[PDB]
Amino acid sequence: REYTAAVEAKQVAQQEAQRAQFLVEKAKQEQRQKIVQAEGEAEAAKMLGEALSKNPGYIKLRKIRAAQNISKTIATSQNRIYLTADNLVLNLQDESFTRGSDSLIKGKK
Amino acid sequence: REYTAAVEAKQVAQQEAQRAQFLVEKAKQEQRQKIVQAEGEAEAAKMLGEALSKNPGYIKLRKIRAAQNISKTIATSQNRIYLTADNLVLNLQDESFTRGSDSLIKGKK
Amino acid sequence: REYTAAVEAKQVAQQEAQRAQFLVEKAKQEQRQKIVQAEGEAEAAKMLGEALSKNPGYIKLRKIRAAQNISKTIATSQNRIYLTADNLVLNLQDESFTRGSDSLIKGKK
Amino acid sequence: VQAEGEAEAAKMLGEALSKNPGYIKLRKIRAAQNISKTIATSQNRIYLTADNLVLNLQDESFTRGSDSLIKGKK
Amino acid sequence: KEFTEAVEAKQVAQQEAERARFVVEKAEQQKKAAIISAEGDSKAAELIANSLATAGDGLIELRKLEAAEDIAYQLSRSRNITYLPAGQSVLLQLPQ
Amino acid sequence: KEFTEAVEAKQVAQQEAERARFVVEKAEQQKKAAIISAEGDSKAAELIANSLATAGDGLIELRKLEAAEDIAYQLSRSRNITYLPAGQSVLLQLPQ
Amino acid sequence: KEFTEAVEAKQVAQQEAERARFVVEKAEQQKKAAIISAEGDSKAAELIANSLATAGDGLIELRKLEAAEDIAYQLSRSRNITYLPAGQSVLLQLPQ
Amino acid sequence: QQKKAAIISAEGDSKAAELIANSLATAGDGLIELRKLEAAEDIAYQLSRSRNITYLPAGQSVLLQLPQ
């Protein structure tokens, strides 16, 4: 079973070493394609880095809008979870109520 | 199957690269459409900063009103979020009653 | 049972020990085969080490993007998990909010 | 006479096995041969500690659970 | 079975390698498209960033408050969502 | 029975040994090709690492925010997953 | 019953002594064979350590992470897996 | 007779230890792991026939509400 199988495997492995350098080429083309897919991801990466790493203005607002896209997606989310209480600062009558978001005075944030 | 598919896909790929420049135009248009969704968001942003970076007043008041609205739709929310003891002070008799209600003092807010 | 079994074992073992030095050879070729499969892996590894060891830019973004890939997979996941909720940092009214994504300023990440 | 004999077996088995109950570990095994002969009629529900059976196989509790013996941890 | 399959794979792979040179071209074009769409999103975002940086954190927090209404709106289409205060020593113990 | 089995194994071992020498050569070609698919991925990764090192952590955090939406999208196609604070004395429990 | 059995064990144990002689001649060879298959694994590994030392933790990390796609592909056939943050007072519990 | 023979059966398995023990004490759990994986195949055929196998956390003040 494995004797003729291995001999034919050696011959087809000559053929497939030729076709495996050919795979170098073809999967190189699919490599550029997948590079380019994850590099549209990466151009999102660049764009957002240059835009919002100097100072996260919309990365602040995207902590926000993407915690809310996460929690516009928490519908699927059976997930038990825990945010923090001083996050939603449901501390309405508190000293640290607007320690949470008088951090709007930049420096606390 | 993948041979005829590949060749037809190469010809369709030439015509679809032309249509892909057309797609670049169409996606600049979608660029504008989502630019503007979050730029109505951003009109809110620019003005809310100019009116609150002075001192977060509607942001104080909108932590309060977003806590109120968060409660308000916690009503329909099954969420086993909570609050806890002693800020909305319903230790209705307490110093903390004058440290959650007198927490409204500026400096403590 | 064990007498004839042992005698046939010894004879079959003479020819099988010839066959098993021959297995040193055979398993050596399988050795190099497994070597080169996990070397596709390994030189992907060398290349990624030049990609990332210099600076964990995509090590950071891939902690996170593998988070999201692992997550697209955690669809099937039952695995009961945690965050540190200051990881997405959904801290939707908080100072620690803009400590999570003022880590955008390189150095805290 | 009886108590001296039995509790003196206890005496000196005790010194020998309290420099280490290592023979008592090999005796877990050998008295377990006898116990596989006999205790077959049993229902024991005996939970014990993690680091015997293999696959705690590279964290602290088992690096001192089986891998302990590396000179430096014993 | 691997001989004819290997020959057809080589032929299909040459067709796909030329088609995939043109698909790397297509991928540059489709990335113009995807960059510009994800940047519909993200250029809306950068103009929001400019608004919040020049004006301050106004709607940083106020879409952290308006969209914080989304928390109470949307948390418990499931049944186990909640939170836990910080600056403290919480004994977190997730529900069952 | 082990006699015939082991002799057959000897002949199979000869053929597999020569086979596998050339499988190692074909695998030099295929290691290049697999490095190349992993290059699709990993070279997207080189350009991402360069992009983020040059431009800070924008999408380090914004695939932690934008594609963190994936976390809510996916975490819960089962019913016992969660995400939960720290920076406290959190004394985590996990459920039945 | 143990008289004939004892004599048989006597003779068969001498035969097994000689069979042991050549079973670990065979097992000189079989130690080598198993050594060498595990060496295929472990020399993929020698050069993997080489690749990730001459280059670094790139894919020491990313075949955690690209392979964490596999973490999630493989874990979930089970239904009680977890991963829970450090920097806390976790009293980690387990499900039922 | 087993003075000789047991001391010897040890000599064998024991110094199988001696050698792997140098392997580990020198550098660590390298074939412990790799034959965790040869194990995976065969041995964890056997140990996936076995039902429940959890893991444990690390780096925390860990505890456990063990199965009832």
Swiss-Prot record, chains A, B, C:
Alphabetical keyword list: Acetylation, Cell membrane, Coiled coil, Cytoplasm, Host-virus interaction, Membrane, Mitochondrion, Mitochondrion inner membrane, Nucleus, Phosphoprotein, Receptor, Repressor, Transcription, Transcription regulation
Post-translational note: Phosphorylated. Tyrosine phosphorylation is indirectly stimulated by IGFBP6.
Induction field: Expression increases approximately 3-fold upon entry into G1 phase compared to other phases of the cell cycle. Also induced following inhibition of mitochondrial protein synthesis by thiamphenicol.
GO CC annotations, alphabetized: cell periphery; cell surface; cytoplasm; mitochondrial inner membrane; mitochondrial outer membrane; mitochondrial prohibitin complex; mitochondrion; nuclear matrix
GO biological process: antiviral innate immune response; B cell activation; cell migration; estrogen receptor signaling pathway; mammary gland alveolus development; mammary gland branching involved in thelarche; mammary gland epithelial cell proliferation; mitochondrion organization
Primary location group: mitochondrion
Record's subcellular location: Mitochondrion inner membrane; Cytoplasm; Nucleus; Cell membrane
Superkingdom field: Eukaryota
Coiled coil: 1-48
Modification type N6-acetyllysine: residues: K10, K46, K60, K72
Similarity remark: Belongs to the prohibitin family.
Function (record text): Protein with pleiotropic attributes mediated in a cell-compartment- and tissue-specific manner, which include the plasma membrane-associated cell signaling functions, mitochondrial chaperone, and transcriptional co-regulator of transcription factors and sex steroid hormones in the nucleus.
Protein name stated in the entry: Prohibitin-2
Organism for this UniProt entry: Homo sapiens (Human)
Residues of the full protein shown: 191 to 299 of 299
Swiss-Prot record, chains E, F, G:
GO biological-process terms attached to the record: antiviral innate immune response; B cell activation; cellular response to interleukin-6; DNA biosynthetic process; epigenetic regulation of gene expression; mitochondrion organization; modulation by host of viral RNA genome replication; negative regulation of androgen receptor signaling pathway
Cleaved signal peptide residues: none
Chain ranges passing through the membrane: none
Family the UniProt entry places it in: Belongs to the prohibitin family.
Organs and tissues of expression: Widely expressed in different tissues.
A molecular function GO annotation: complement component C3b binding
Induction summary: Expression increases approximately 3-fold upon entry into G1 phase compared with other phases of the cell cycle. Also induced following inhibition of mitochondrial protein synthesis by thiamphenicol.
Chain segments annotated as coiled-coil in the UniProt record: 1-35
Key word Nucleus present: yes
Residues with N6-succinyllysine modification: K26
Assembly: The mitochondrial prohibitin complex consists of two subunits (PHB1 and PHB2), assembled into a membrane-associated ring-shaped supercomplex of approximately 1 mDa. Interacts with STOML2. Interacts with MAP1LC3B (membrane-bound form LC3-II); the interaction requires PHB2 and takes place upon Parkin-mediated mitochondrial damage. Interacts with STAT3 (unphosphorylated or phosphorylated at 'Ser-727'). Interacts with CLPB. Interacts with CD86 (via cytoplasmic domain); the interactions increases after priming with CD40.
Boundaries of the shown chain within the full protein: 177 to 272 of 272
Protein name per its UniProtKB record: Prohibitin 1
